[PDB]
Design a binder for this molecule. Structure first.
Ligand SMILES: Nc1ncnc2c1ncn2[C@@H]1O[C@H](COP(=O)(O)OP(=O)(O)O)[C@@H](O)[C@H]1O
Ligand SMILES: [Mg+2]
Lengths: 142, 52, 287, 36, 194, 144, 140, 94, 51, 51, 272, 34
């Protein structure tokens, strides 16, 4: 996995130069295992990864400030890229261009909500299923 | 140093006190039981797999 | 006055037996008798009963012959048998009241000023107690409506001494219900609770419809209680209740989830034990 | 059970941070004080 | 483990072949600060007979420890730069100075924000003896790494603190640990049933 | 404890006759008690079986004794007491789980009470929690 | 006067001085200290009345109800609270004095359950009364 | 008249009802509670009155018909949940 | 139970009804001393002595 | 006692000195009855000078 | 039907039971009891009545008929009149407080400190002193800041009249100490019984020496105490037996001298 | 519960639990031991 070690470093940094170096340096292994289109869809999701980190640690970052810290050109390109990120649903924020900021979703305390209900519902269903399958298969010979 | 249940807020510049609900000992005991059952399923790995 | 009337299984069975032993030999509809019991504060404890000859004309509705000489002699005999039990009213096995009832209560008020009429319904219904208890009240109505001698409800219950629990338990052991909450039984209990709530709401609606259309007069006591019920209805769309409900539902389901995980681990352990037992048996049989 | 033959084949619990920084916290702080 | 052992054998330093006792107490202080909670640190490194006796002869390390404990933070970064340049030269800590510095920075930030809910970025910079841009950069880095519990708001520069309540944290721990146990039991059952 | 009796004629067991003939296998399904044997359950008197006779109406009227009201069916449990019960049972179950780990390890090494207690406690917790939770939802819907 | 001090409703101090003012002619000389004491009792009864008929009173309104100043009212409430005489948390930032004890989820749902229990009992009693009513008036 | 769902009474609502400006609606609700007619509380930061009770009185035939209609709706709800539960728990009813 | 096992000064249980002997209980007397036999073996060992 | 395979007993102290007469002799005799019953046995007596 | 059977068992554990003393464990499932009626019966104890706690000589309820043991009633004399004096009340004698505490309390609060060194806690200490300098009060003060029990006796209470009654009471006292887990036993005046090796040529000096010998046995013997402590005040501290003074498993020594100027100033402060 | 207490005839003593315990009771009430 070392080639993927280098690739992950490049993507995390957002260093397209190092990404191109890694592609030119281990491209054969990628075409061998079979990844060579996913590793360009990478380029795409590399800019996406940048925006996800930005929207993971921020609550109201202004666009002119995403342009820079995401390595973009202009607030217009910021508008488009962040909007597409939200559309793909990887950052989960709103946006406001009346003043130009990208306020996220005020996290709601998820214990006065049905999310715990649902999670424990999946897990309880699972546990009951294993009890069923385990009490079953207790074959006795005669 | 945990002298009273309050949190500052350096925006409007305001100190907000509150009563911290006691840690629900039910979930504490529950997590302890999850860990112990992890030990049990490990022991059961050993038994089952190595006698079968 | 008296607030509560706790009737006993012996009284109920005695009434059933009276009704059967007269209906077999004739057809009298009602059967009428006296109730014997003791007070304790304002809580009547009916602990015995006995039939008193009765006969009435179902047409005239004011000709009847409850036999007070028989009542007195019979009460003398039961006073000799057991003395801590004095006449505390009467009973009749008719599904509904009758015009005579007030006159009969006036007769029995000679032997007990605080008379309690328990209309023990022999027919077995599936929703309510078989006893409904009434007491006669004449008083100037506060609303200025003309006053007449009519009955008033007194809360009723069924309870038993230990000497009678030992009997009811033995008689019902065959078709008894486990005195413990099996999850199926508890879900059944909740379904039956919904049944009962529906039945009561239908009764209230039927009465209100009759009142509105006019076939019945308005009872201010009933309207008071109904509007107090509506007063007491709760609100669920309120936010700091939905929050609390979700919180405690989640806590309960954490306990449930931990229970399920423990059950899964135990089940797997038992499966392993059995597979090993079968493996050993197969190996030993082979060798 | 079956080796999937059809598929050809430090001691420090590191967790990233192996970035490239102007030293960790010496030159950064020096320049910080200098510009403050 | 380094802190546990060092603090269990600081009153009994007998191995003068490995290093001087000044060096041993300095190492105990360093490892203790990086590995110990605030209660234990107060009980066993600031209220410690020998570990505080030698700090009289060691003036640059006493300041480093007491800055963090007293919540004087600008002095804490000054002493942290000192400690970094010392440990880089050192030979047993040399492949650990980046990690020590980073983890002590995270300890300092978490300590400051443990008693706040919305800390103005300017005030926090003034407290830490740095600027606004430096704090922005490093908080972004550490929140991304997931160590801190704080979300920045750069339009009006304010660092809100989204610490999780006791119930919510217990929920998340139950989810995670139960997930691990469920994976293990699921493997076991799928394997042995068939 | 009710027993029915009747006497034996003085010229019955002395004339060379058994006290009471036997034509059906019915009379030997109930065993006598030593208490009565001592006083002569078979020297001066019989013991006739009882066989209580219950109609279909008496049984219902008696069921009314403990019949639970729809209120008791649809009424929630005091939430404070319920939470205390959850906590106590989960703690006792934790103790049994520690003992169970020890027991399984010990038995698997060298070649039950923990398992059975754990099973009963899981039963009680799940029944209580599910019942109260469902009652709560039912009420939230029915009364609004 | 005793009627007002046993009535469970607010008494305005200004109107009380207008009405029963001239009955001090102890309340003479050091009766002025005793006058401050009577005003203190008036403010304290007003606070009891508010604490029992209110959940959140703004200071800008409580000052009017007590006849004191925006700050004197705060001081008197604070003294009461420290002495443990009136439960009141004063969010000074917004003027949101709150007499509501924090609602435990247990207690909130327990109140819900008690409401429902009373409801079911009352519908049962109403059904029995309805049965009696129909049983009687159907006879006529 | 108002049902429990939105039994929160606003001061402006009271003022548009019995004609008093909103600085003595507080006293009106004070006297109402004191006399024992209406139970509840006053939350005047947001200017609302949580009435949790009312002195039951003698109604008219129209009002009783209103109550009948509400009982009808309530019965429909109860029967719906009754059927749902009994249909989904058919196998565990003893 | 055989008669030979009913030795003098032995504790025997008699049916509450008919007073028929039905066991040879664990002969024992004088709780003052029956509480004297050592059940728990002390923890000292010969290795704890010297000289 | 820790290293013996025989019934170890203790009688240490003034245990045989009880107020009612005709009691100490009975106690010692019943103690040796216990020893003979659970033979082989070792009876310890600390501070015999007392008793 | 299994549920019904379980309920029938829970019912056999009835309420109107009669109390009596379970004597011995005859076999599996069966045992011998002696009712409070004064007569002994042999019965079968219900399943799972905590045969762990059904120890011989136990208090237990019985089914009125069949006399079947179906309960273990959880069963006093001293250490219930909670003391009042406190360490703030006692002035000076810091050394005496230190030593008595290390001997009496810490073994009960922090026994890990003792394991680390690998020591047997000193159960048993003795306080010297003139007629009055404060030792009863420090005993009462440890009772104040105690968590187990403080069972106080006076040596005369062992010097009581009737042969063997003194030893009986000492054995009862130490047995109570043991049955309580961490309890403390205090003896106020021991010079009455704790004496030298006088060859008792009468019937009374012999009994006094018997009291002392029983005390020695109980303090140390074949039945090594479990977490029980002992405190003594003597007022002479010279004619005590070399045994009871055995500077080993029987006692430590503490001094309680006449209040010096320091102690006396503290006395004035605390009283005044 | 019933003051002046009057423990008299002290003279005429083989008793040792009768010591001057001197407990604490409700204030007031005294004794004149003679
Ligand atoms: N250090 C002290 N502080 C206060 N009071 C003391 C002190 N020492 C002795 N006393 C007084 O002595 C009395 C107790 O003496 P005590 O300890 O019984 O002496 P002894 O038991 O040796 O006769 C108490 O009433 C107390 O007031
Ligand atoms: Mg003393």
């Amino acid at each position: 996995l070392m080639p993927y070690f280098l690739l992950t470093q490049a993507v995390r940094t957002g260093n397209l130069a190092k990404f191109n170096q890694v592609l030119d340096q281990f491209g054969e292994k990628f075409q061998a295992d079979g990844t060579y289109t996913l590793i360009i869809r990478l380029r795409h999701n590399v800019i996406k990864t940048g925006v996800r980190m930005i929207s993971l640690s921020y609550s109201r970052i202004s666009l002119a400030d995403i342009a820079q810290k995401l390595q973009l050109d202009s607030p217009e390109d910021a508008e488009f890229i962040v909007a597409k990120a939200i559309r793909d649903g990887v950052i989960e924020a709103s946006i406001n261009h009346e003043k130009g900021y990208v306020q996220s979703k005020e996290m709601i305390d998820i214990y006065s909500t049905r999310e715990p209900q649902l999670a424990f519902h999946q897990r309880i269903s699972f546990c009951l299923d294993i009890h069923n399958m385990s009490v079953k298969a207790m074959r006795f010979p005669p | 140093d945990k002298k009273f249940h309050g949190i500052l807020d350096q925006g409007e510049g305001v100190l907000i006190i509150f009563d911290e609900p006691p840690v629900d000992k039910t979930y504490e005991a529950a997590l302890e039981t999850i860990q112990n059952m992890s030990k049990v399923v490990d022991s059961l790995y050993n038994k089952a797999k190595k006698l079968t | 006055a008296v607030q509560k009337v706790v009737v006993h299984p012996l009284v109920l069975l005695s009434v059933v037996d009276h009704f059967n032993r007269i209906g077999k030999v004739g057809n009298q509809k009602r059967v009428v008798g006296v109730l014997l019991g003791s007070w304790q504060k304002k809580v009547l404890d009916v602990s015995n009963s006995f039939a008193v000859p009765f006969d009435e004309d179902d047409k005239d509705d004011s000709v009847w012959f409850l036999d007070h000489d028989y009542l007195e002699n019979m009460y003398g005999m039961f006073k000799k048998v057991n003395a801590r039990e004095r006449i505390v009213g009467w009973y009749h096995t008719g599904p509904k009241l009758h015009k005579n009832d007030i006159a009969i209560n006036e007769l029995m008020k000679r032997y007990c000023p605080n008379s309690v009429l328990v209309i023990i319904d022999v027919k077995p219904k599936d929703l309510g107690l078989p006893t409904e208890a009434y007491i006669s009240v004449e008083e100037v109505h506060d609303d200025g409506t003309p006053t007449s001698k009519t009955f008033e409800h007194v809360t009723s219950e069924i309870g038993a001494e230990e000497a009678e629990e030992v009997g009811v338990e033995h008689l019902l052991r065959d078709i008894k219900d486990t005195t413990v909450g099996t999850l199926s039984q508890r879900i059944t209990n909740q379904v039956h609770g919904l049944k009962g709530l529906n039945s009561k709401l239908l009764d209230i609606r039927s009465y209100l419809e009759k009142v509105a259309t006019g076939k019945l007069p308005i009872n201010h006591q009933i309207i008071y209680q109904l509007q107090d019920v509506f007063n007491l209805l709760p609100d669920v769309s309120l936010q700091e209740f939905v929050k609390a409900f979700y919180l405690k539902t989640n806590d309960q389901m954490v306990v449930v989830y931990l229970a399920s995980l423990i059950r899964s681990v135990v089940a797997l352990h038992n499966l392993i034990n059995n597979k090993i037992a079968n493996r050993d048996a197969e190996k030993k049989e082979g060798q | 059970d079956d080796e999937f033959e059809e598929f050809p084949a430090h001691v420090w619990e590191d967790n990233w941070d192996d970035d490239n920084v102007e030293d960790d916290f010496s030159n950064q702080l020096r320049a910080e004080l200098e510009k403050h | 483990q380094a802190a546990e052992l060092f603090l269990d054998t600081v009153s009994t330093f007998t191995s003068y072949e490995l290093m001087d006792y000044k060096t041993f107490v300095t190492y105990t202080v360093y490892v203790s600060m990086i590995a110990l909670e605030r209660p234990d640190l107060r009980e066993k490194v600031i209220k410690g007979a020998e570990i505080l006796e030698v700090l009289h002869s060691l003036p640059a390390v006493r300041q480093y420890l007491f800055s963090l404990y007293e919540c004087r933070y600008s002095v804490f970064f000054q002493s942290l730069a000192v400690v970094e340049q010392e440990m880089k030269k050192d030979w047993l800590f040399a492949p650990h100075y980046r990690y020590y510095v980073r983890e002590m920075r995270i300890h300092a930030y978490s300590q400051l924000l443990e008693s706040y809910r919305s800390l103005t970025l300017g005030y926090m910079a003034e407290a830490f003896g740095v600027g606004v841009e430096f704090i922005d950069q490093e908080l972004s880095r550490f929140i991304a790494a997931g160590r801190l519990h704080c979300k920045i708001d750069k339009v009006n520069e304010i660092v809100e603190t989204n610490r999780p309540d006791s119930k919510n944290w217990q929920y998340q721990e139950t989810i995670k640990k139960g997930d691990l146990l469920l994976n293990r039991v699921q493997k076991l059952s799928r394997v042995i049933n068939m | 404890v009710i027993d029915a009796f009747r006497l034996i004629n003085a010229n019955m067991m002395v004339l060379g006759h058994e006290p009471r003939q036997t034509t059906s296998n019915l009379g030997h399904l109930n065993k006598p008690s030593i208490q009565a044997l001592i006083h002569g359950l078979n020297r001066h008197y019989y013991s006739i079986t009882i066989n209580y006779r219950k109609n279909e109406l008496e049984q219902k009227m008696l069921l009314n004794l403990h019949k639970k009201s729809w209120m008791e069916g649809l009424t929630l449990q005091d939430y404070s007491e319920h939470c205390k019960h959850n906590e106590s049972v989960v703690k006792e179950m934790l103790e049994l789980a520690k003992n169970y780990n020890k027991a399984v390890e010990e038995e698997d090494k060298m070649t039950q009470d923990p398992k059975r207690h754990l099973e009963e406690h899981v039963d009680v917790l799940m029944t209580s929690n599910i019942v109260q939770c469902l009652a709560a939802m039912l009420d939230t819907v029915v009364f609004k | 006067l005793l009627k007002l001090f046993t009535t469970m409703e607010l008494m305005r101090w200004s109107t009380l001085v207008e009405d029963y003012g001239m009955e001090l002619r102890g309340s003479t000389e050091e009766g002025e200290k005793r006058w401050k004491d009577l005003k203190n009792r008036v403010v304290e009864h007003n606070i009891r009345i508010m604490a029992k008929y209110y959940t959140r009173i703004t200071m800008k309104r409580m000052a009017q109800l007590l006849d004191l100043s925006v700050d004197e009212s705060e001081a008197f409430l604070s003294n009461l609270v420290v002495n443990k005489t009136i439960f009141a948390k004063v969010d000074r930032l917004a003027g949101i004095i709150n007499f509501q004890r924090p609602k435990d989820p247990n207690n909130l749902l327990n109140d819900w359950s008690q409401k429902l229990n009373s409801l079911m009992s009352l519908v049962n009693k109403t059904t029995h009364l309805i049965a009696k009513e129909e049983m009687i008036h159907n006879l006529q | 008249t108002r049902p429990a769902n939105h039994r929160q009474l606003t001061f402006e609502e009271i003022a548009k009802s019995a004609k008093i400006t909103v600085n003595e609606v507080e006293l009106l609700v004070m006297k109402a509670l004191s006399v024992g007619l209406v139970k509840g509380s006053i939350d005047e930061v947001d200017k609302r009155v949580h009435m949790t009770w009312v002195q039951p009185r003698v109604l008219d035939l129209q009002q009783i018909k209103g109550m009948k209609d509400r009982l009808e709706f309530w019965c429909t709800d109860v029967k719906s949940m009754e059927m749902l539960v009994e249909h989904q728990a058919h196998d565990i009813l003893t | 139970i055989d008669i030979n096992d009913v030795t003098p000064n032995c504790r025997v249980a008699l049916r509450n009804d008919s007073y028929t002997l039905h066991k040879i209980l664990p002969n024992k007397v004088d709780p003052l001393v029956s509480l004297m036999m050592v059940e728990k073996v002390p923890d000292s060992t010969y290795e704890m002595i010297g000289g | 006692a820790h290293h013996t395979d025989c019934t170890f007993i203790r009688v240490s102290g003034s245990e045989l000195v009880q107020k009612f007469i005709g009691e100490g002799a009975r106690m010692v005799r019943e103690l040796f009855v216990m020893a003979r019953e659970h033979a082989p046995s070792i009876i310890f007596m600390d501070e015999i000078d007392s008793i | 039907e299994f549920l019904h059977a379980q309920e029938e068992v829970k019912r056999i554990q009835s309420i109107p039971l009669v109390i009596g003393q379970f004597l011995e464990a005859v076999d599996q499932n069966t045992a011998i009891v002696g009712s409070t009626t004064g007569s002994n019966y042999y019965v079968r104890i219900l399943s799972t009545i905590d045969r762990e706690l059904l120890k011989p000589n136990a208090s237990v309820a019985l089914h009125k008929h069949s006399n079947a043991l179906v309960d273990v009633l959880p069963p006093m004399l001293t250490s219930d009149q909670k003391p009042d004096v406190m360490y703030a009340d006692i002035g000076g004698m810091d050394i005496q407080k230190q030593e008595v505490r290390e001997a009496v309390e810490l073994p009960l609060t922090h026994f890990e400190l003792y394991k680390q060194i690998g020591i047997d806690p000193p159960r048993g200490v003795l306080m010297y002193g003139p007629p009055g300098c404060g030792k009863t009060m420090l005993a009462k003060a440890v009772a104040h800041h105690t968590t187990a029990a403080f069972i106080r006796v006076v040596g005369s209470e062992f010097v009581q009249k009737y042969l063997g009654e003194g030893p009986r009471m000492v054995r009862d006292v130490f047995r109570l100490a043991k049955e309580n887990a961490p309890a403390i036993i205090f003896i106020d005046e021991i010079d009455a019984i704790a004496t030298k090796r006088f060859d008792a040529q009468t019937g009374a000096d012999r009994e006094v020496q018997r009291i002392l010998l029983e005390l020695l046995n109980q303090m140390d013997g074949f039945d090594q105490n479990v977490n029980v402590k002992v405190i003594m005040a003597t007022n002479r501290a010279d004619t005590l037996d070399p045994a009871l003074l055995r500077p080993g498993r029987l006692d430590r020594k503490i001094e309680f001298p006449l209040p010096d100027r320091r102690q006396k100033r503290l006395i004035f402060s605390t009283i005044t | 519960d019933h003051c002046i207490i009057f423990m008299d005839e002290i003279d005429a003593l083989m008793e040792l639990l009768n010591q001057m315990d001197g407990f604490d009771t409700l204030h007031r009430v005294k004794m004149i031991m003679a």
